[PDB]
Amino acid sequence: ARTGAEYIEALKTRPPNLWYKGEKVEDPTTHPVFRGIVRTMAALYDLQHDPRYREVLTYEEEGKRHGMSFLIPKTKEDLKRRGQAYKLWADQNLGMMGRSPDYLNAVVMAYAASADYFGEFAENVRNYYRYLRDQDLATTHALTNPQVNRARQPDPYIPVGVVKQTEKGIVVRGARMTATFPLADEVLIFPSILLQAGSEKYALAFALPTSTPGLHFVCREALVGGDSPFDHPLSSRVEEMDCLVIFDDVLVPWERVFILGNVELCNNAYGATGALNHMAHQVVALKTAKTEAFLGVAALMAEGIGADVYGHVQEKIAEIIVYLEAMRAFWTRAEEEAKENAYGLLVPDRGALDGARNLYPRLYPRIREILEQIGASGLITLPSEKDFKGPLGPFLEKFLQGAALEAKERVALFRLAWDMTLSGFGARQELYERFFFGDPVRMYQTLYNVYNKEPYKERIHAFLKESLKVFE
Amino acid sequence: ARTGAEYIEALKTRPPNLWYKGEKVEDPTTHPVFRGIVRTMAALYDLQHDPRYREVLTYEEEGKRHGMSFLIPKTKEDLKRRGQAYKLWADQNLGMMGRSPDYLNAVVMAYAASADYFGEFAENVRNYYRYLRDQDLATTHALTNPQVNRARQPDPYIPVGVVKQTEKGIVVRGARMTATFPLADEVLIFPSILLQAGSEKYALAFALPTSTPGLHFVCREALVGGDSPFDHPLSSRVEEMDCLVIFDDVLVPWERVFILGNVELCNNAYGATGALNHMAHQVVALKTAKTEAFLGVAALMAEGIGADVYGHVQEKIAEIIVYLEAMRAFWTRAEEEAKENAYGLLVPDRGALDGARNLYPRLYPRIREILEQIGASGLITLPSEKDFKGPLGPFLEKFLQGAALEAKERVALFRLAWDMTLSGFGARQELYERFFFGDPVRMYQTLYNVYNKEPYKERIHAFLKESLKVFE
Amino acid sequence: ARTGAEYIEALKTRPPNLWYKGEKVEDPTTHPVFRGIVRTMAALYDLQHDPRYREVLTYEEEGKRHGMSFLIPKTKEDLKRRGQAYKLWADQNLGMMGRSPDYLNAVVMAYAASADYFGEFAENVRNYYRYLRDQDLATTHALTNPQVNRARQPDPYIPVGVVKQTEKGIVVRGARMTATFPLADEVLIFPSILLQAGSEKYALAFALPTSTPGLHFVCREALVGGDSPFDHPLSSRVEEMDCLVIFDDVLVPWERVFILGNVELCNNAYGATGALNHMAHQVVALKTAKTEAFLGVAALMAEGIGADVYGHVQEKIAEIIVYLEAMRAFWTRAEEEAKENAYGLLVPDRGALDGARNLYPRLYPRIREILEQIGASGLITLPSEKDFKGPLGPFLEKFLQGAALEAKERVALFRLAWDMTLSGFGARQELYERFFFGDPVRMYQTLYNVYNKEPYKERIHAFLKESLKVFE
Amino acid sequence: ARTGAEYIEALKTRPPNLWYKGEKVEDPTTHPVFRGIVRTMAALYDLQHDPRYREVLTYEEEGKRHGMSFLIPKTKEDLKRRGQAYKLWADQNLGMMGRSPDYLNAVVMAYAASADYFGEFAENVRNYYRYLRDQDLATTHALTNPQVNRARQPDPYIPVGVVKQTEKGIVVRGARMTATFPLADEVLIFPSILLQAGSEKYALAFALPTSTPGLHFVCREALVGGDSPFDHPLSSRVEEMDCLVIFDDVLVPWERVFILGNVELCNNAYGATGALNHMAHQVVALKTAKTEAFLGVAALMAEGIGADVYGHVQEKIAEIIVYLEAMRAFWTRAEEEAKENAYGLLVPDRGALDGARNLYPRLYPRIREILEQIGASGLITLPSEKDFKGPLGPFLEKFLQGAALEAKERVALFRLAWDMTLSGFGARQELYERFFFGDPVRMYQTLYNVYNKEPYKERIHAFLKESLKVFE
Ligand code: NA
Ligand code: NA
Ligand code: NA
Ligand code: NA
Fold first, then answer.
1. Where does substrate bind (chains A, B, C, D)?
2. Which domains does chain C have, with CATH numbers?
């Protein structure tokens, strides 16, 4: 429903409380560090109004059209529709934008369908879902706790906790270490870390406008690099930004509270509501798109330099193909095996999604490595468009050709491969893939604990009956 | 349709021309090296008559019942039925029997449905399919060419070639290096290696009874070890055997010829007919069953020795779970994306099956390693059931307990884990998984060449338009 | 000093209390399961009297000649001499015999040189060293504790503990899970597992003749396979055997007690005495020899089948070469950086030896994999010498040739490659390399804790001074 | 001998013909993109005059003092001295400067000692060595050939070739794709790629001042990022730069020609002269220093966030320790096994150096990965020193602490870890380690071909005699 113009106007009128290198960012839509991603998100919103993609990206309901990521799926076909929307948006940025709002709309959609889970705060959840849906707003998630130097009563508000409760709502103080893509209208403070018994003061779930007084987003090093599409094909447009989120006695209205002082409710929220399943559904579609981009670049690089005649290179590209097919397989099974949860919400299969989200963090570094191995040293000496336009341009056109590519074309392609792997932007993507869904160690331990291993244990026990029978 | 008794009687009456350590095997049904696998195959046939599995393992047609692996699938549901049959049979032997006849029935079924591919030999193919189906016979595939010492006119019949053609059929001479599970009624001489231009004399496809004069199967080292289910839980029953296949001027009746002197027809047979797709479908179901067995053993081992409290061990088991889910995903997508080929035969998706068959050979050695890492040195000092039954039995019961298992139970379980990984039988399984479908290097190069990489290359080319536009 | 004949006579006269499949082994020198390794150890002893190797394998002292592994090294040259002896013995069996007595003589030699460490039991240690040296006896180490099923006062003697102390010595009861190469005159009960506070009853170190009443060695599955050098080139001669060691109220004379009820002394024994350093020195020489054998086989296999023309194969062999050089490097630095410990005993560098023993367990599975990848399916269908000698021999000679090898030669070579990797014997070698020195997880944690990381931390702290200076 | 001031004055007076983004660089000593590395190289030169390091970094000869990397070693002690100098210089920049001039001085030193190899150009080589030594100049190597688009007589001067020969010297035209650290007085055009028969026009070896008319160095993307030591601890000072090198009818005086039109001489130059051995000696010392830096950072990171209590983290740090010890071992053996080559030049052992240079390219990506795994998401949201100095500084000091570190200290450390791995500078280091010495595929094939595998093949042949004897 939202247009790119509406999104841009919203951030310009009520900008997120962003700070960059010790200074407040007055207008992120024009600031050199953020204007690129803002334009990109704006383009994602505009695509919703392109007739060619209207049916893929939006659905009609009572005379209004809403983004597909808000659709509460009733059938497997509806799930497929949500998946197609995730994929189309992902493809626009070669799967490089990892925290586009549809992944969180998936979470809020599930929370709302499973609103009974929240008890007294159920209506708050349903109303918030309707607000985000109707206004088609952008969201960001603030997660991870700070640490305290115990080498130095103690301050109980380092991590975000409730200072007090009033007739208007709750006052919170503390910080969240990470919020990716802060160019949003709203920030969600939902649990991503297990809470131990006694941590009620920190067991909260709520949402706030990003301009809320007392709320501050502190940026890390900008990885944009430049505006030239030739020199910085990806960083010039898909640099989402990561930030520290500070809560200085922030007032959270009661209407925006979803969970308050309940350890168990927080710990089981994502799984019980189905938010885990739906957000992971967006993720598998996203990573399929990302892998497709790497396959395309690898294939073009190999052909462009005539390296495709080498068995070694063909094998590496085939390896990327195997991984692409693995991700497509997880995506297909996630949808085909979907079943309704305790609240009647159809959710994609967790086994398939757990497989995808626990395997891709291992596959990605290898996919990145493969591109480095194909490009080799050719990725480390790429000139700028300015050099082609300068006095030595003629020399560059004569010396920077590929076995099957003209100079400008080869450099444009290798600059993209470089931006996908070795630029500050590209390297960040690696760290991001390794950890965005959580620490792999914890994720694997979680998978071990939740998985029903009984059918297999029983089959082996049955098979061993003949072994123990020798003693009869 | 066939019963275990009928299969046993068939091999006893007309045994395959098997040789073991320089001597002819008169009765494989009673010989210590082969009676185990014979009994196992017999049990697979008997299961077809168990009312609980009749509908899963067989289908009715004109008053007769045939094995499900012969069913020419018309719908995705039919494909699912074939898959369920592959899985049920596989589960009986923990996915350790890698060349049960249903994988080749899948090949012959596809050949028959796509019989037009064979031209003048089309009816031969259809009739052979009907013969195998009606009699429910067991088959084995003889593949791989011998080498010739060129450090020594030359003998043109080292690999299997046509010596002459007569009114009765063709006379062939040469050898195939491998035939796994030779306890079969028939041997298929189909192409698995690419033929170069000019190799018409070797471009053949035919089938023969395993007792055919001039045909000899020479066995390698027996890996059975013993008959005790406790000491040798798997090798005592699932040792399929591998053999060299010699053709000493063997007469092949014209009715058994499917391809004669046609290089192109041989090279495209498996892909064009859909045999590749259907055989790979049996394989993915089989490997899913195999992975489930490893998961069960790993889980029981960890719990039995209290190692499940270690994060490291939980992580390794979760890794097996990720691989199990990956294989289930490939299997699901293979069926859901199925489409009809040029001959109207519904075939499971090759992308998904290529992913599965090119990934599992890499996953298996790791799955095996994980079991070794969980069992550790505990896998290297396992006593025999005879020691428990001997004078020191009481000591063993007191000293060989697991943190949560009695001695006999722990040893029975570890003996199984050992037989699945470190016994001669278990180690062979590793080599087998690495190469049964082909040399990974060639397989990956084949995947690279057949895969349509254009959609991805086009997306990147489109994305790079903005890069090259800077020069406008 | 000892001859093979003396060793054989010793085991025949006073055989270790060995049990195989519920029965006592009366004469291991003639028993089919043990005669091979007995002959091999005998050959190692005989080599000491070959004039060509006398100076490498023995040293003279006061009119007597002793095995080099007993030499207390005073100079780096002496260390080199010990290394050359380790290497020569290792080479005789292609580095496949992993527990030849010289590795334990290294331990006892260090214990004796550092005898003061043992306090009141110091003379016992010195005298035992002299006994083993003078008689040139063979030893085996019994290690690892049993577990107790807590799913079932408790029996405090599952692991080996002291039941009582008398005027004659101590009475022990319990079991050790592993003893490799039990074809020895003596068994050492030394600590390999960390002891916790309060475990004094189990903190012991002593030695006993293997025929001691109450002592029982229970064998696991025999991996010999056969006596044919062609069919079983390694298992027929280097199958050391592993066994469970039972202590049924065994009396240990006071003269054979080295540590009694001292937790700290046990925990620091190997490191403080230098036994760790010297035993690891034997190990690095041993693994260098083992890697050389794999390199030789891989090279001959590649050349024999003409696979050496493939870049992929050359790369795999070069990988083995890199690992061989790494091990040679660790060995060289271990000797060149040697320094005296607290007791004045020259000990090889622990940093280099810790690197070698923590890296090889990871390199070995890959070296094994490489051989499997070069041999491929050719390793799974190897006939017996009996087939070459049988009626089909002529066919085998014509069909089993290598691109540059005659049939018998290729099969002999591949049978060796198979015995080094896929036979029960070969697969055991893999598990053995992964764990013989300890659980890698514990070994790496031990390395982390003992390593002086301060120099590096200090360099970084110094480098960061400029970073923090920006706030001045 | 040279001081930092002399080096700076030299580049300012006669600057290399550098181009950055289409413009000539007039003064690299003050240009924001190059002043950092210039200052760093200057500091390396100044260290030579610090009394504490004078004996390590320089040697006296006839009243003059020269850089240690010019010393022609006569004894193993001399080799050790060269190694200590390589190490001290490397440590100043945490092993991040990969092309400091001493690695090329090692090449020129070897060329000079083995000058007879060059025939008629021998005196040219000796004189050039003396020139570089006496003036203590900095050098850079221009390598790798361009490609030609054959999808488009042909221009025979794409790669560097001789256009004509005159009484003054030779005129060359073409390009070299890479030259790292162009902030040098001289550029060496030596062979790094195998030349095929008939490529005489391209088989050349010569040296030129970097300001030579017709010579142009074209820079790739600057990776400096910023001058703040806090925000960019490494990129602000060790960004060496990589560039394309253009030769536009450049005149090379005869005195600067070392090899002219000789394919074989070029192909065997590095190996025959010993340049390969000596340059690889600098490399192993360099990588040992680099690994020590990673160990220090990893250790400080783990302790700083209290992650050192996790077994997983301890294991990863121990892994870095194993790799550090491996590199130290290769370095030690390279020196201890040194022998004189055909020209009487003592050269470090190639086996050890081939092991080091072929293993480190595989170890480095893992070492980098380990740092990413320890720092995790904490590496992706690091604020700037400007944020600590800004209005929100107090909040940052309260929320960015480590379990055992104050905020500024933790961020300074993590910023360093980030700059070593994920910044554009850090990621480039990864690609650089993977390929600076050559394509691993070619390097491994070269190792396979040059290594004497006969001793191992012979040992196996001898061992197999017993196998073939069964047929006697
Ligand atoms: Na730029
Ligand atoms: Na047995
Ligand atoms: Na045998
Ligand atoms: Na900056």
1. 99-103, 141, 192-193
2. 1-137 (1.10.3140.10), 138-261 (2.40.110.10), 262-472 (1.20.140.10)
